Amino acid sequence: SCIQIISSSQTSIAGHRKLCNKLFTLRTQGFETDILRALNIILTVKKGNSNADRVLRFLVTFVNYLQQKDPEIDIVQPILKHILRGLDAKDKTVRYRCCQIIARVVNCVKEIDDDLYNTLKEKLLSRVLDRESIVRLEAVVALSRLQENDVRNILLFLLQNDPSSEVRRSVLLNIEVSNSTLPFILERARDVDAANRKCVYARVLPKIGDFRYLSIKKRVRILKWGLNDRDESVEKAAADMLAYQWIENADNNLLELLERLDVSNNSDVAVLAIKKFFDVRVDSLSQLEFPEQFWLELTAESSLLARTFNEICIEKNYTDLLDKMPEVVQLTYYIERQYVSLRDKSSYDESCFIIEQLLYIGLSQDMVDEIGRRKLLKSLTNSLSTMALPDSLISLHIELLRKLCSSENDFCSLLVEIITEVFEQGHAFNELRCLSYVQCLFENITSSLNENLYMVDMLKTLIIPAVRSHDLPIREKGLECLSLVCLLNADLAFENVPLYLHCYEKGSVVLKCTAIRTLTDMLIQHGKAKFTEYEDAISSILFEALGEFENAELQTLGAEAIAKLLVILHYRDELFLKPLIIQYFEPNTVDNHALRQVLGYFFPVYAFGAHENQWRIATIFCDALLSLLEIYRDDDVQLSIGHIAQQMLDWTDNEKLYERGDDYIALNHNVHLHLANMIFESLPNASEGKERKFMISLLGKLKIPTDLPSSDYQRTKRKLETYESHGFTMDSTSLSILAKFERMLLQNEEA
Amino acid sequence: RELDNAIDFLQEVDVEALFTPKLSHWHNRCLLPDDYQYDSKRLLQLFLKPKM
């Protein structure tokens, strides 16, 4: 009857309206009782049942249908009183169904009796800490119906620390949105689960009416994460929020939106946002117009838009769209108008940004227009000779100059003439500007052919005098200039290695960083064999740098230098691979996130690039891991080591090679079976206890293929036996791992 | 559907029995590694001549 109506809603949802009417004929009765009887049978069904949700969907549907009309019958209060008793239960599903039901039923109306309010709150607050994840999920949904502090603070706590992604998402989807709760939902934009990240852009942020409510630094941090996200869906959700919601708050005026991003201080994010907006809204790209008026009233946002539009069309090859960008003749004119604005300080910072954008547009052009090429060259030749551009624009000016010159020789000739004229004027600020021109000169040439005389000149006239100057800024700038000249001549590089070694030991941190970059670049540029006389001295400073956890910048630099020397040159990999792994996992360096970022990228690239790189890691694996054990004993010690070891094991797994001619892969020895041999030979030097126990634990995690030659399995068993002959005392699990490993070897020989 | 779930709502149930009356692992607080900052292009660039 009344219960069988419910049992009939089991199959489908279409008839729910029909059954609501018939059941609405039996209101005046064992009404209440029969429903609770139906729910008592919903507590027995385990999760995963399409029905239980259908039945429960039918009930929430009928309740609402009942409040409209004949609200005389208050059935939400009895049903909640009956089911709250089960919040404390041992069948996790009785708890999960109870929370499931309460969450949906309470949502059917707001007016509740206070005693029903308090009791439900007290019991639910304990539930959201349930041992099962499914209970927590439905509990926060139920609890979130009694929001408004203590209520709220608990949701922030699970959202932030709950180990289950589905739970976090449920909290993320029902928590209140306010400046107090805002910082934590934005953190989820970097959640490990893609769906949780996508939820922040797709559902949670739209709840905020306007993006202006956020601080400018919040707006930028959002787009930086969203538009660069690794997952195609999260990245799409962030681009849609930017291209359909945020553009709306800015009156559908892209410029007005750009003005709310402080583009001059957030250039990289602002460019990406523009590009992503037009990936979503390609129709708008063809609607931008750049009349003469546009270029005479340029702004920071207006100029960035043109530079990005030009950047897109070139990449996308939208040739007809590029016809809207000006010719170099007009561009040279637009730049020169902007120079005038540099005289007035109130418009100085913006004009530097505008000029920057125009130079980028100019660097993009392939100007067959000799006429306009000559004009822009004159303008640049003049601006560098007479004006006092900031260090920021100097580089782009000299870079664009190189692009216009017919060859490196004409570029050196011209730029030396400019440097000499600027040098005559001053005869501090003047000399530093000259050296900045010298620095950009040697940054834009690649070989020393045909420019010996220009070099010997810059050396005698500026660089050496600067290197010997007692004024600290000039000396530092002179050394950077000297370094770039060493990258053009190997013999000069070799002649100055002693100087840059003297810079590291007796110099400041700034000078140590100059030495690391210089010596590293001389090796990469000129080759490894040229400097073998200084091999130990250079490696020394690379070691010392990597161990200075006091200087995050210097430490990160040594780590980076080693990384590129290994990948590019294979520069004593064996010697550095172990100190690198130790420092990378060392606790004293954990706070240095810059270092963990470069090595976070290097190890996968190095390990997974070649079979020989995985072999080198297994060769020092044990010694690196043992060194970390000693370091770690001095919060949880055993748990972190396990994650470290599994990382090193993944690096050495042959299956994880990226892979890309090798006819003789035949007798390549398996790195993991080679690592087993390493472990057997190192167990004696381990200290009995967790250490020797832990090293044996790794034998069970190894990935040994079953198609290797028999002599390989035979060789490792010999290693196994040699270790067994020591007669060390081992616990049960150790002996079980060794026995299971020894039998695996036999089985793979047999096959 | 072919997959009968399937529920018999006339079965006998004992309410008191079902109603008969926290968890501390709870580190790496579910956030991606910092890896978007390092421009992978830096590795194969010279420190002093990035646009090489």
Residue numbers in the entry:
A (entry chain A): 2 to 30, 32 to 150, 157 to 435, 491 to 697, 701 to 726, 731 to 821
B (entry chain C): 477 to 497, 503 to 504, 507 to 509, 512 to 537
Quote the study that presented this structure, word for word.
Condensin protein complexes coordinate the formation of mitotic chromosomes and thereby ensure the successful segregation of replicated genomes. Here, we identify a direct DNA-binding site in the eukaryotic condensin complex, which is formed by its Ycg1Cnd3 HEAT-repeat and Brn1Cnd2 kleisin subunits. A peptide loop of the kleisin subunit encircles the bound DNA and, like a safety belt, prevents its dissociation. Firm closure of the kleisin loop around DNA is essential for the association of condensin complexes with chromosomes and their DNA-stimulated ATPase activity.
To gain detailed insight into the nature of the DNA binding site, we solved crystal structures of the Ycg1–Brn1 subcomplex of Saccharomyces cerevisiae (Sc) and of the homologous Cnd3–Cnd2 subcomplex of Schizosaccharomyces pombe (Sp) to 2.8 Å and 2.6 Å resolution, respectively. Both structures are strikingly similar and reveal a harp-shaped conformation of the HEAT-repeat subunit, with the kleisin subunit winding along the concave surface of the HEAT-repeat solenoid. The peculiar curvature of Ycg1 and Cnd3 has its cause in three discontinuities in the directionality of the solenoid formed by the 19 HEAT-repeat motifs. One of the two molecules in the asymmetric unit of the Ycg1–Brn1 and Cnd3–Cnd2 crystals shows additional electron density for a segment that corresponds to a long helix (α1) in the N-terminal region of the kleisin subunit. This helix and the succeeding well-ordered turn stack onto HEAT motifs 16 and 17 and onto the α4 segment of the kleisin via several highly conserved aromatic residues in a manner that resembles a “latch” that has been inserted into a “buckle”. Through the interaction of latch and buckle regions, the kleisin subunit adopts a loop configuration. The absence of density for the latch segment in half of the complexes suggests that the α2 to α4 segments of the kleisin subunit are sufficient for complex formation with the HEAT-repeat subunit.
